[PDB]
């Protein structure tokens, strides 16, 4: 009895992909594809995202009809909506799904902490599960969980993060998220056993909460990589995540879709279901 899944933002880039992966997944069944683009309207969702025989689903553009349709007891699992929609509409699409009882799986792009607070409230009151997901890559999130665990027994830790050299911001978003997570415990790391001298400014990286250091490397040849290094006497423990090309959200997306069924309220971060 596979899961019935709506994909909002269906004709979009990540959207097209997710449609593809749901087709390949037997325990997941696409009931409906939605997009704003008038140019993509009639087409079949499967065919459109590039595969062989077209499914039986056209790329319509009205949400509630499809929601109501889904929340009509299928006899199988509760229904899921995966959103990949422009920032404008994300809050309202999500809220609209929650209202109908349909579980949202959606990234944080387009959503402010205050809005998430509000969606949290709608979900608790609705007792409808919802996943807000800052990072979709499994490896990153296992790394994050593993680091959080380890931080309770190690007092010393540094983060090294390496990206392609076209990348403007430093440190990256993810290295900082990872630092917040570690620092949420209210434990201070890296307490000095010596007064340091910076012979050259910048050598020790940036300071990011509860004494944690982040170092940022930029070179061509890299894509996205992150390494967390925990130290103790006689001992080093290193968690690394490397990205090979930028289409590895998928297992996370599908994992979100499966795991949200277990939820009666909103959860921030995938590292919490895992
Ligand atoms: Mg980033």
UniProtKB/Swiss-Prot annotation:
Its EC number is 1.17.1.8. The keyword Hydrolase does not apply. It catalyses: (S)-2,3,4,5-tetrahydrodipicolinate + NAD(+) + H2O = (2S,4S)-4-hydroxy-2,3,4,5-tetrahydrodipicolinate + NADH + H(+); (S)-2,3,4,5-tetrahydrodipicolinate + NADP(+) + H2O = (2S,4S)-4-hydroxy-2,3,4,5-tetrahydrodipicolinate + NADPH + H(+). Disulfide bonds: none annotated. One of its GO terms (cellular component) is cytosol. GO terms for biological process: diaminopimelate biosynthetic process; lysine biosynthetic process via diaminopimelate. It is an enzyme of class 1 (oxidoreductase). This is 4-hydroxy-tetrahydrodipicolinate reductase. It comes from Trichormus variabilis (strain ATCC 29413 / PCC 7937) (Anabaena variabilis).
